[PDB]
Amino acid sequence: GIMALASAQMYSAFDFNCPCLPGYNAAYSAGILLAPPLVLFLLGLVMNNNVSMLARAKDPAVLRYMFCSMAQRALWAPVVWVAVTLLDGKCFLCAFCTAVPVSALGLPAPELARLLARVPCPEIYDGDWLLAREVAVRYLRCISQALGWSFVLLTTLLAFVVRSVRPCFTQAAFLKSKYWSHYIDIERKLFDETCTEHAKAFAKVCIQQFFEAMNH
Amino acid sequence: GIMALASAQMYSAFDFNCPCLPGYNAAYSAGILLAPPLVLFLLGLVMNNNVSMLARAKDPAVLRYMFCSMAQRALWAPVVWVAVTLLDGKCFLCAFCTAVPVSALGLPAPELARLLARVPCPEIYDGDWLLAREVAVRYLRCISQALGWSFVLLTTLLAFVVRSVRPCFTQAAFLKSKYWSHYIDIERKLFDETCTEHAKAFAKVCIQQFFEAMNH
Amino acid sequence: GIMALASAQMYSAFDFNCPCLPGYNAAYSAGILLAPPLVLFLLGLVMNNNVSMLARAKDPAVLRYMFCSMAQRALWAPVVWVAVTLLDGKCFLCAFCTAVPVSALGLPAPELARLLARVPCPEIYDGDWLLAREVAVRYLRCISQALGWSFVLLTTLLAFVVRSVRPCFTQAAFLKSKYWSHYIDIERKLFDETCTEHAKAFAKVCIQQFFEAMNH
Amino acid sequence: GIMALASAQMYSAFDFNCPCLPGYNAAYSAGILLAPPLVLFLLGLVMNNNVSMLARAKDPAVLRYMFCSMAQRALWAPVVWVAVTLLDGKCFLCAFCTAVPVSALGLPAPELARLLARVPCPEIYDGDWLLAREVAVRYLRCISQALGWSFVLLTTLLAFVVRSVRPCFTQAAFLKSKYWSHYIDIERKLFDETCTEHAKAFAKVCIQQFFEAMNH
Amino acid sequence: GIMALASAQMYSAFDFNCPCLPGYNAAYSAGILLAPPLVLFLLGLVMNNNVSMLARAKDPAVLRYMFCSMAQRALWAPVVWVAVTLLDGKCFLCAFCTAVPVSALGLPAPELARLLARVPCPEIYDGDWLLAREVAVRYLRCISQALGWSFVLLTTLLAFVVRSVRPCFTQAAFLKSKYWSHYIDIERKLFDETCTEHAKAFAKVCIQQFFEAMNH
Amino acid sequence: GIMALASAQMYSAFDFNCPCLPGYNAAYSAGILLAPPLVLFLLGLVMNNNVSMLARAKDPAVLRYMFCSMAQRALWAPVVWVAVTLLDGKCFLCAFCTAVPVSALGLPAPELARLLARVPCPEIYDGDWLLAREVAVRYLRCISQALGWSFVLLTTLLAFVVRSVRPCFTQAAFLKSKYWSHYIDIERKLFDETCTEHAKAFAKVCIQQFFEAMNH
Amino acid sequence: GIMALASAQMYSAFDFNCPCLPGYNAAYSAGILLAPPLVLFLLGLVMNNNVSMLARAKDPAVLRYMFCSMAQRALWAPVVWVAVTLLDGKCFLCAFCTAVPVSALGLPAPELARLLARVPCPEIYDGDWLLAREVAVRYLRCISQALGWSFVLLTTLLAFVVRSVRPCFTQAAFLKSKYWSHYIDIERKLFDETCTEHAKAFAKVCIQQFFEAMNH
Amino acid sequence: GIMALASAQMYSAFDFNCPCLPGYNAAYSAGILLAPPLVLFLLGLVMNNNVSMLARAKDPAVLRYMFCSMAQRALWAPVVWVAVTLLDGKCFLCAFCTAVPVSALGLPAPELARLLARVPCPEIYDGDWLLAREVAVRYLRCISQALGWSFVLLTTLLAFVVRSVRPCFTQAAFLKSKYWSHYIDIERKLFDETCTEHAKAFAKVCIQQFFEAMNH
Ligand SMILES: CCCCCCCC/C=C\CCCCCCCC(=O)O[C@@H](COC(=O)CCCCCCCCCCCCCCC)COP(=O)([O-])OCC[N+](C)(C)C
Ligand SMILES: CCCCCCCC/C=C\CCCCCCCC(=O)O[C@@H](COC(=O)CCCCCCCCCCCCCCC)COP(=O)([O-])OCC[N+](C)(C)C
Ligand SMILES: CCCCCCCC/C=C\CCCCCCCC(=O)O[C@@H](COC(=O)CCCCCCCCCCCCCCC)COP(=O)([O-])OCC[N+](C)(C)C
Ligand SMILES: CCCCCCCC/C=C\CCCCCCCC(=O)O[C@@H](COC(=O)CCCCCCCCCCCCCCC)COP(=O)([O-])OCC[N+](C)(C)C
Ligand SMILES: CCCCCCCC/C=C\CCCCCCCC(=O)O[C@@H](COC(=O)CCCCCCCCCCCCCCC)COP(=O)([O-])OCC[N+](C)(C)C
Ligand SMILES: CCCCCCCC/C=C\CCCCCCCC(=O)O[C@@H](COC(=O)CCCCCCCCCCCCCCC)COP(=O)([O-])OCC[N+](C)(C)C
Missing domain, CATH: 1.20.5 (Single alpha-helices involved in coiled-coils or other helix-helix interfaces)
Known part of the structure; x- marks a missing residue:
């Protein structure tokens, strides 16, 4: 509840600015997609009143059930955060802008990966020849929303299966x-x-x- | 209730931008019309406290009734979402803009399907000759609202019939x-x-x- | 109550744009005046807890009374919707703009019905000669409000008669x-x-x- | 109470636009002053729980008292609506603009009644010679507020007399x-x-x- | 209470526009200062539950006391309305603008009373020679606030005397x-x-x- | 409480405009500083339920105590009003603008007192030579705030003494x-x-x- | 509580304007830093219900304790006011602007102290040569915030010591x-x-x- | 709770302006990162009702436990303040702007450290040659957010360990x-x-x- 509400309203307060440099683009976006999900998982285990009691006078079956039920509620923020990040397109645009088909809908290996890297930055972008900046944008933000909906689907089709077989129960x-x-x-x-x-x-x-x- | 309120207010937060490319227009719009309805259906089955009990000591008639009554409430978001999407015109405009009568109220096969595909994108549209952009718009958004009202009618005329015969009851x-x-x-x-x-x-x-x- | 409040606040959220084409003007406006009234009628019958019981151990007089009292409350949204639509003038302006006296306060049969059809669309209207656009507007929106008040009168003078004779009672x-x-x-x-x-x-x-x- | 609050807040939602044509000005304003008062009267009789009982086992004196007390509360919206309409000046300006002294503070019979009729419409008014438009306005809106205060006075001096003699009591x-x-x-x-x-x-x-x- | 709150908030909703004509200025302002005070007095007598009982089995002393105590509460709106009108300056500016010393801080008898009468109307004022419009304004609005404070003083010094001698008591x-x-x-x-x-x-x-x- | 809250919020609603004339400046400001304090004093005596009882069967000591305790609460608005007026600077600026050192930080006796009197009025001020208008302002508003703080100090150092000796007690x-x-x-x-x-x-x-x- | 909330919200309502004159700068700022702290101290002693009782039948130890505990709560506004004033920089900028190193990051003794004194006043500042106005500002507002944090530290490190030894207890x-x-x-x-x-x-x-x- | 809410909302009210001088940049930022964390720690020890009781009739084990549990709640503001400061980039930008690779993505030792020091100040920055100001910005604000997320991770991975071993317990x-x-x-x-x-x-x-x- 509150954990899931603090996961979507913590995304708008954090500003995504990316470097638009030909090597830092991918590293910066990989970490602003994986780290805060991993922080919301540990912040859900730490804040329920059973993390110490599981850390013996109790049957092994009762421990395994009380553990697997503990994690499943910690997975509601890590999933709502990754979905809102892919449905926005900013993280996908910066990490993959350097590899875009410039021949379809459109210099050494350098001078081109350094020109394409400034696409997400509108005030820095110089190479308005060879590509309109709103044609490379608006094409990477559609591949990003096809993945953002394939993730919400395959994730909701998996929370449905673990309510009909109910493993570890x-x-x-x-x-x-x-x-x-x-x-x-x-x-x-x-x-x-x-x-x-x-x-x-x-x-x-x-x-x-x-x-x-x-x-x- | 809340499921139906989260279905209409989830439409305004999600931005519809379409690629305006002569092949991605239809594929992008077909999936941004069918997938989130399918996600709101599974998200209504998963969140009532009978999905596991139906997954024997109970009569077959009691199971069939308790199943068909389970789905009918999951159909209120999938119907309110498809109706608000057709009454807006954005999804219909992008998928069908490439096939519009340019002779009535108005180059090889290419150079024309690539010119017409940029109609929903006002900053990309070049071919302001052969067609005013607000004449092709405002004509596809009226065919979209004739279908959006024929859908609310035939769907309300069907929820009326299943309250007078009451099948599986x-x-x-x-x-x-x-x-x-x-x-x-x-x-x-x-x-x-x-x-x-x-x-x-x-x-x-x-x-x-x-x-x-x-x-x- | 809520049905009548959702009838007037559903009118401002739905955008009226009309095609301004010499044949689609009347067909589009006839359906955006008749269909949503018909949808609010069936949506009032469906949502009271007697639609199935009337669909025998009960006297015929008791059924006829319990039916006619059922419809009369479904007529509060269909009447409030048609009144707010005529008191606005947008639907009347598009359907009748093609037949306006251009000689009084002012080319084959075509080239004139196609020029007059763009009156409700300010950015498309070319023929600012032969007619000022705000002179043809502001004259069709006054004939529309004379009918919108003649409808509220004759409809309120009829709800008064069916509280003094009280038929089917x-x-x-x-x-x-x-x-x-x-x-x-x-x-x-x-x-x-x-x-x-x-x-x-x-x-x-x-x-x-x-x-x-x-x-x- | 609510009837009187829905009478003043229904005036600001309804837009007064007038035709500014030399014959429709007076007819349009006479009906947008008389009809909605007549609708608020019948809408106060219809909505109290005695309209049918008066429509015999009861003394004639008891009926006459219970009738005259029924109308007097229906007269609070018809009076608050006519007062706010005269204290605004829009209805008085359109109906009488064609007959204004142009010699004091200032062409056949036509070409003058057709020029004067466009005074309430600022974008249509051409004849800025022979009269400043803000001199003809600001003079008809003062005669309108002298009548709007003479009406509130003579109407309040009459509700005072029918609380001291108390006829039909x-x-x-x-x-x-x-x-x-x-x-x-x-x-x-x-x-x-x-x-x-x-x-x-x-x-x-x-x-x-x-x-x-x-x-x- | 509510009567006094509806007296100050009814002043801002009513627009003061004055004719700026050399004879209507004084008549218009004399009536927009005296009439609504007289309407708030009768509207306080009418709306207390003793106006009819005083309109005999009761001693004359008890009637005289119950009458004079009835009026004194009706005098709170007529006094708060006249005070807010003099502390604003609009009514004083229009009625006395035609008689202002143009020699100090500055044509027949006509052509001057008709020029001075347009001072309160900024868009109509032509004679910006012989007088700056903000010098004649800002001098009549100070004489108006010296009277608006002399009225609140002499009126509060009189409500103090009728709480220490307490006549008719x-x-x-x-x-x-x-x-x-x-x-x-x-x-x-x-x-x-x-x-x-x-x-x-x-x-x-x-x-x-x-x-x-x-x-x- | 409410009397002190209506004393500071009655200052912002009342507009201070001053005449900027070489003789009316001081008279206008002396009265807009002294009169409304005197009105808030009498309006605190009048509105407590002992003003008549003091206006004999009671000991003289009990009357003197019950009188001096009556005034001390009437002094909270007259003090909060004079303090907010001196901490604003508008009243001090208009009354003393005519006597300002124009040699330090800078024509007969007239032509100078009439030029200096328009300092508080920015649209009337002509003599932008011999003095910048923001140099004469910003120097009179600092002498005004040194007095506004010396008044709050000496007044708070006096309410402290009359809680330690407690005269007439x-x-x-x-x-x-x-x-x-x-x-x-x-x-x-x-x-x-x-x-x-x-x-x-x-x-x-x-x-x-x-x-x-x-x-x- | 309320005293401390009225200390920070009384700072934003009071406007700090300073004279920008070479002698009044320091005197004005010394008094707008020391006086209102001294007023909030006496206004905390006066408004607790023991100031008179201490002004004998009670032991000397009980008086000394009940006095020193009385002052310590009066010190919460005088400390919160001096801290918000130093963390803002306006008071420090005006008092010390006349003594700033113009050689580092940059005429008799006069003509320079009179030029430097107008730094806090942007519309009066003439000497934009010899110093950029935003270089002298932004350097005095950093020395002001180093003192504003050294004051909150040494003051919080002293309220910690008087909770561990607890003198006069x-x-x-x-x-x-x-x-x-x-x-x-x-x-x-x-x-x-x-x-x-x-x-x-x-x-x-x-x-x-x-x-x-x-x-x- | 409130301590942690007053730690993040006290950051937006305090303005970060930095000197942009080649020696004060680092000293100013080191103190606006370390001091207010140290003030929120002492302000959490002082404001719980056990600081004096620990300052003997109680066992040493009970004191050590009651002390270490006292500090751990004082560490929620010092950690939330350092995290919001690194996730903003302003403090990191000013302290390290003088040491930035100007050869990659881009005069004695002076004339360069004095040119680079004005990067965080947009109105002071002159050297728009040798570096675009938005290229040096947007590169230091990404190194600042890689550290701001490595701090929230290693700090949340440490609050998890001290809930599973539970030292001093x-x-x-x-x-x-x-x-x-x-x-x-x-x-x-x-x-x-x-x-x-x-x-x-x-x-x-x-x-x-x-x-x-x-x-x-
Ligand atoms: C206020 C809200 C904001 C508005 C909405 C915003 C729009 C959001 C739109 C849409 C969001 C809708 C998604 C809903 C999904 C269900 C949640 C879930 O999974 O938990 C279920 C687990 O089920 C699973 O095990 C599936 C988890 C798959 C692993 C994903 C790892 C996440 C990190 C990705 C790493 C990959 C990185 C690579 C990325 C390319 C729980 O199962 P349950 O049956 O519920 O039982 C528990 C009962 N309980 C719930 C009572 C405790
Ligand atoms: C806050 C709200 C937002 C504001 C409003 C926004 C404006 C919205 C405007 C208008 C919306 C009004 C529509 C109302 C329709 C009724 C709902 C319904 O159908 O359920 C009824 C089922 O009845 C059916 O079986 C019909 C369903 C047809 C299948 C449609 C599939 C949907 C996916 C399309 C795929 C095709 C894709 C192709 C597209 C071209 C339920 O029947 P019931 O009698 O009620 O019994 C249940 C009782 N209960 C209700 C208590 C549980
Ligand atoms: C929040 C509100 C929004 C603000 C207001 C917005 C402004 C709105 C302004 C004004 C609206 C005021 C109108 C009020 C009319 C009364 C309603 C009514 O009719 O029902 C009465 C029926 O009485 C009838 O039978 C008359 C119906 C005529 C048929 C009309 C068909 C409608 C579709 C048109 C197709 C034609 C298309 C062609 C068009 C050219 C009910 O009678 P009753 O005595 O009440 O008994 C029931 C008791 N009950 C009420 C308790 C159940
Ligand atoms: C939220 C409010 C909005 C804010 C205010 C907005 C500003 C409004 C400003 C001012 C409004 C103030 C006016 C108050 C008048 C009193 C009302 C009244 O008359 O009823 C009284 C009847 O008394 C009569 O009989 C007089 C009616 C005369 C007939 C008028 C016809 C109206 C249509 C005109 C056609 C002519 C067209 C030609 C036009 C040129 C009732 O008497 P009573 O003693 O009260 O007894 C009933 C007791 N009860 C009240 C408990 C039931
Ligand atoms: C919502 C608020 C707005 C926000 C704040 C706005 C900022 C305001 C800033 C600051 C205001 C702070 C000032 C506080 C002073 C205390 C009040 C007082 O005096 O009463 C005390 C009397 O004590 C006296 O006798 C002193 C009065 C001196 C006479 C002044 C005459 C006033 C008219 C000037 C004419 C000179 C004209 C010439 C001018 C140059 C009462 O004493 P007590 O001990 O309290 O006992 C009563 C107990 N009781 C209180 C329970 C009843
Ligand atoms: C409204 C909120 C605003 C919105 C959010 C804003 C976004 C914020 C985003 C993210 C913030 C998330 C961080 C959460 C971390 C947990 C807190 C913690 O540490 O306390 C834990 C201690 O555990 C430790 O001992 C770790 C502390 C390490 C020392 C750090 C020193 C801080 C000063 C740095 C100096 C270095 C300077 C150099 C810098 C380069 C407490 O452990 P516990 O198990 O909880 O037991 C106590 C139980 N209790 C909690 C009930 C009392």
């Missing part, structure tokens, strides 16, 4: 897991109210021992 | 289905409160066994 | 109808609470039969 | 009217709860007769 | 008035609940007499 | 005052409920005497 | 202080309810003595 | 700590209600001793 392990998660909470609330009554008997003997001073 | 199967859906919930709430009382008797023996340490 | 049939509509609801709420008690006696025997496994 | 008829309006409501609420208990005894015999099927 | 008449205003309300609430019990005994005999029809 | 008179203010309220609430029970015994005899008419 | 004096602050409140609420019962016995004898008049 | 010390934190609160609430009852017995003897004065 047995009713014996699903029941034993739901019981132990209840024992955790009740033992907590019982401990607190036993701490606020064994202390309240020492409070009354401390106050009247300190009400000895300010009464004379 | 019998009162015997409608009653048996509503009963089993109640047994699911009551067995759930009875299980939990039996788990928070069989554990609460072991809590009191654990706390005083751990209140053995911090009292001496 | 008898106190015998109005009373029998209000009773059967109460029997529908009470039989529903009685069925549910009988389903959550006959099942709750089988739940207790299932849980302790499944509390046999995770206790040893 | 007698304490005998005011008391008999307030009693019959209470008998209407109590007989309604008594009928419903007698319909949900005579039916609830047939529900229990229908459910267990339909709980005969899904129990074996 | 005696404790005998203030007590008799507060008692009769309580007898009005209690006799109302006692009448209603006596009307909903004498009718409820006839309802039960009507329903079972009409439950005679729809039971056989 | 004795605990005998503070206690007698708080008691009489309680007797006022309790005698009020006791009077009302004695008026709604001595009248309720006459209501029952009036209703059944008027239920004599509409029952036969 | 003893548990005997902290306990005696918290008790006397409770006796103040309980003696207040006990006094009031004793004033509304000794008066309520005289009310009943006054009302029936005044119900003697309006009953005959 | 033992269940004996975690239990003893949670108990003492409960004894603190209960001894507080017990002290107050013992102070409002030992005082309430002296109040009744003071009031009637002061009700001796104002009763005679």
